[PDB]
Amino acid sequence: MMSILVISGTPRKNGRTRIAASYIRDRFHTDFIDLSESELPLYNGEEEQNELPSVQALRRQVKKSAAVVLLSPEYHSGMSGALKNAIDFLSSDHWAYKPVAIIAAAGGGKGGMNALANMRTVMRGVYANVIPKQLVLDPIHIDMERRTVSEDMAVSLKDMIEELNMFT
Amino acid sequence: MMSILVISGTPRKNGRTRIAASYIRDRFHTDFIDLSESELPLYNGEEEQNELPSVQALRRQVKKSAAVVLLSPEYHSGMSGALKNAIDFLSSDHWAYKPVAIIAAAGGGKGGMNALANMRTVMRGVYANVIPKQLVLDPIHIDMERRTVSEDMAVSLKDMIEELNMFT
Amino acid sequence: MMSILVISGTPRKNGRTRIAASYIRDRFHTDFIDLSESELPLYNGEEEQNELPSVQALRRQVKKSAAVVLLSPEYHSGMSGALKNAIDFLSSDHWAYKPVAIIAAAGGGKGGMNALANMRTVMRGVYANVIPKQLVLDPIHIDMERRTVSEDMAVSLKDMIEELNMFT
Amino acid sequence: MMSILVISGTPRKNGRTRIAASYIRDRFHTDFIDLSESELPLYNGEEEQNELPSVQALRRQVKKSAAVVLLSPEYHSGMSGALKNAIDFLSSDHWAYKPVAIIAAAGGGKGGMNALANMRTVMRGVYANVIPKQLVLDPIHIDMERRTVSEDMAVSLKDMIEELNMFT
Ligand SMILES: Cc1cc2nc3c(=O)[nH]c(=O)nc-3n(C[C@H](O)[C@H](O)[C@H](O)COP(=O)(O)O)c2cc1C
Ligand SMILES: Cc1cc2nc3c(=O)[nH]c(=O)nc-3n(C[C@H](O)[C@H](O)[C@H](O)COP(=O)(O)O)c2cc1C
Ligand SMILES: Cc1cc2nc3c(=O)[nH]c(=O)nc-3n(C[C@H](O)[C@H](O)[C@H](O)COP(=O)(O)O)c2cc1C
Ligand SMILES: Cc1cc2nc3c(=O)[nH]c(=O)nc-3n(C[C@H](O)[C@H](O)[C@H](O)COP(=O)(O)O)c2cc1C
């Protein structure tokens, strides 16, 4: 399913979001953008950034994807600045009508729902079609030592991919 | 009023948000953070970033301020990635109970309200006290040639500063 | 297109939302729920309400519809209490995967976007598929004397119905 | 503390929100509005509603309060229609600058955060000052048999009242 693009929105190379994103990439054989090892600079509006290979690659990969799984940690009740910075390079030219499944990684408790709301609002702002199924990944869902997701989360992610494909 | 800190959240050196932010800085004699000329890197969670002068300065300036005017452009129905990246370096240690006035710069029409909602949610996430008065700056409110705000917007900004001081 | 259900969420019989909703009903030959002339009581959780004809009709009409146009005025930065009360009688049994187009009627200026966000969040909460195209109807878009919508709004509504049908 | 007004926003007489709201009323000796036993009709915009005793009482009680604890269940990712209906009778005349603490009652899991966001947005829409401290009451926090809150929730509510008083 290389027509699906998984975007790992944590900038932390050891972040939980990246464990979940890499799991999805390998389980469903997707394309991948990893914001913990990206050469993207901070967007600054200057024309020269349009010529940067990292920016050109981001735009090309997002535009070509048939569907996106968008993962972000919840940092201070919003998506990560790293993910929002990447989105600021993009527009409805890359996203319009694209099916998108959103996942937030949180710290437990009630966390993650504010990031999901922020992601849904921004995705609608680029005219994406965010599917109803959304997920919060808590620490209980991530095995740090084995670098994978829990059994129940794996079932949930399969259901999410099935719904994403239905909207594609 | 150097106890007020104005944060210009656009990364664009010629951005409208920066014209409004600089106006407030000069009119009310505030401290200033300009995310269009910052050395802040993308937050990456690594311990080494705690030693960076740009990060130390951001934390020191926010923590010491008695109140903040937080300005951001609305990019894709959210605050800028540049501003969110800066906030990701911070915590309730720098923001708790601080009075904050939020301003979004938009393109006209209905724009700006989604950025304001995102800013209010993230600010509450660091335990700031966002005051009720909020503003959207549209192109009609910004004189690009004279690099200042319109007469009606200047009145609105004075009312905002007065309310911010009341909550301080 | 009686498979489309238009829900007029204003409780005001002379409200602008109802002018727009009735326009859509007549232009596209839809089903109709009018919350300005409904016998629905306030939801109170009591079992007896499940037997009320108004509640049974609301549930039957929503469940059978292939798609919904959901209109609400923005009252205090949210959808109307009348519309939310009606939704409180419903569940994912009536809404799951249903394509929904949301419209907010506002007072001009920046109004309407908070109602749209509230509507999108609640609709996702019942598992509906809210389409990307959303509209705010301002007073300039409503002819009170002729009880219809402006020419530009009529074009926008046709585009909205076309997109809604695509997602159906 | 009769200058504090507690608003129980569930319409269900046996609802968990009402157990928490009644606990606060009795513990802190507050004024009380109970939307499970209210004579308020659905707001309909007609002038005659301004003369109804229930509407006059709601407006008088809210306006006179020095601070409000606003409780609502989360119904479909928003505040209850009953509470929103009551707010639709009100305006900034009753709420402007009033300190407000928001509490959502949820079903467990991740629930409650969408109601809190909706409540914060609507309260800002009437110019209230919603304090940073917010709470979600889950079933674990409510003793149905004893009709009171758990020990840890009682501590949290005392901290909330202390913060509300600070903003008053
Ligand atoms: C700056 C920062 C802010 C955070 N804010 C939140 C938050 O608002 N809510 C939450 O549930 N977790 C929050 N967390 C914890 C993350 O959810 C947690 O680290 C999770 O593993 C996702 O981040 P990661 O993918 O980088 O590991 C925050 C973490 C950091 C470093
Ligand atoms: C990537 C990008 C996204 C934008 N998204 C929005 C938007 O969602 N809503 C809006 O009203 N304006 C949007 N704008 C326009 C800005 O509001 C406008 O440029 C304004 O001047 C603020 O940006 P600035 O301070 O960088 O100039 C966007 C601009 C850019 C470059
Ligand atoms: C109680 C009340 C609250 C309102 N709040 C808002 C608001 O927050 N934002 C806005 O743009 N208009 C607001 N309005 C104005 C409505 O948007 C306007 O009346 C519009 O016509 C939709 O309402 P209607 O369909 O009942 O006419 C409010 C009107 C009332 C009566
Ligand atoms: C129509 C309806 C919708 C509900 N929606 C949600 C929801 O979106 N999220 C949630 O956590 N709980 C939801 N609940 C469960 C309530 O949170 C739970 O009943 C809680 O006790 C608060 O309601 P109460 O005060 O009326 O008892 C819903 C309950 C009903 C009856």
* DSSP track, D106-166: --STTTTHHHHHHHHHHHHHTT-EE-S--EEE-GGGEETTTTEE-HHHHHHHHHHHHHHHH
CA of A15, closest CA in chain B: separation in Å? 9
In chain D, residues with a C-beta closer than 8 Å to the C-beta of C16 are none
Cα–Cα distance list, C168 to C97, C161, C163 (Å): 9, 10, 9
Q: A151: helix, coil or strand?
A: helix
Cα–Cα distance list, D84 to A111, C37, C41 (Å): 25, 19, 14
Whether B11 lines ligand 2, by a CB cut-off of 6 Å, is no
**DSSP structure class, residue D56:** H
Q: D73: helix, coil or strand?
A: strand
The number of the ligand 2 atom at minimal distance from the alpha carbon of A88 is 1
DSSP element (H, E) containing A118? helix A113-125
Counting every residue written for chain C, the total comes to 168
Chain centroid to Cα C69, Å, comes to: 5
- Residue B64: partners with Cβ closer than 8 Å, 6 or more residues away: none
Chain centroid to Cα A112, Å, comes to: 14
Experiment used for this model:
X-ray
Positive or negative: CA dihedral A157, A161, A163, A164: positive
Q: Which amino acid is at C110?
A: K
Cα–Cα distance list, D45 to D49, D53, D95 (Å): 7, 16, 19
Contact by Cβ (8 Å): B29, B5 = no
- Residue B155: partners with Cβ closer than 8 Å, 6 or more residues away: none
DSSP string, C67-129: EEEEEEE-BTTB--HHHHHHHHT--HHHHTT-EEEEEEE--STTTTHHHHHHHHHHHHHTT-E
Rounded to whole angstroms, the Cα distance separating B149 from B144 reads 9
Distance B83 CA to ligand 1 centre (A): 17
Contact by Cβ (8 Å): C121, D114 = yes
Rounded to whole angstroms, the Cα distance separating D80 from D118 reads 10
Domain of D141 in residue numbering reads as 1-168
In chain C, residues with a C-beta closer than 8 Å to the C-beta of D128 are none
D135-137 and D129-130 as β-strands: parallel, antiparallel, unpaired? unpaired
Q: What is the 3-state secondary structure (H, E, C) of chain B?
A: CCCEEEEECCCCCCCHHHHHHHHHHHHHCCEEEECCCCCCCCCCCCHHHHHCHHHHHHHHHHHHCCEEEEEEECECCECCHHHHHHHHCCCHHHHCCCEEEEEEECCCCCCCHHHHHHHHHHHHHCCCEECCCCEEECHHHEECCCCEECHHHHHHHHHHHHHHHHCC
Q: Which of A75, A77, A138 has the most ligand 1 atoms within 8 A of CB, as the residue to mutate?
A: A75
- Which token pair is C161? 């119905």
Rounded to whole angstroms, the Cα distance separating B49 from A82 reads 15
Instruction: Tell which residue, D100, D135, D98, has the closest CA to residue D116.
Output: D135
Q: Which amino acid is at A101?
A: A
CB within 8 Å: B117 and C112 = no
- Residue C49: partners with Cβ closer than 8 Å, 6 or more residues away: C41, C43, C55, C89
Among all bound ligands, the one having the nearest atom to the CA of D95 is: 3
Rounded to whole angstroms, the Cα distance separating A103 from A157 reads 10
Rounded to whole angstroms, the Cα distance separating D147 from D145 reads 5
Cα–Cα distance list, A115 to A4, A110, C19, C87, C99 (Å): 22, 11, 36, 25, 24
- Which token pair is D75? 């119904």
Identify the bridge partners of residue A71 per DSSP, sorted by sequence position.
Answer: A8, A103
Rounded to whole angstroms, the Cα distance separating B49 from A118 reads 26
**Quick check: C120 contacting D, CB < 8 Å?**
no
A120 sits in the region (left: phi over 0; alpha: psi -120 to 50; else beta) called alpha
- Residue B127: other Cβ atoms inside 10 A: 17
Which amino acid residue places its CA nearest to atom 17 of ligand 2? Answer: B106
Instruction: Give the CA radius of gyration of chain C.
Output: 15
Instruction: Tell which residue, C83, C122, C76, has the closest CA to residue D88.
Output: C76
- Residue B104: half-sphere exposure toward Cβ, Cα within 13 Å: 24
**DSSP structure class, residue A31:** E
Q: C133: helix, coil or strand?
A: coil
Q: C90-93 long-range CB contacts below 8 Å, 24 or more apart?
A: C90/C58, C90/C59, C90/C62, C90/C126, C90/D76, C91/C126, C91/D76, C92/C126, C92/C127, C93/C63
What count of CB pairs under 8 Å joins B to D? Answer: 24
Residue A41, phi then psi, degrees to nearest 5: -85, 175
- Which token pair is C20? 């727009």
Contact by Cβ (8 Å): B105, B135 = no
Which amino acid residue places its CA nearest to atom 20 of ligand 2? Answer: B106
Contact by Cβ (8 Å): C58, C91 = no
Distance C120 CA to ligand 1 centre (A): 25
Rounded to whole angstroms, the Cα distance separating C166 from C161 reads 9
Cα–Cα distance list, D27 to D19, D21, D139, D155 (Å): 12, 10, 20, 12
Instruction: Give the CA radius of gyration of chain A.
Output: 15
Number of domains in chain A: 1
Distance A113 CA to ligand 1 centre (A): 12
- Residue B29: other Cβ atoms inside 10 A: 11
**Quick check: C109 contacting A, CB < 8 Å?**
no
Cα–Cα distance list, D15 to B84, C46, C78 (Å): 39, 11, 23
Residue B140, phi then psi, degrees to nearest 5: -60, -20
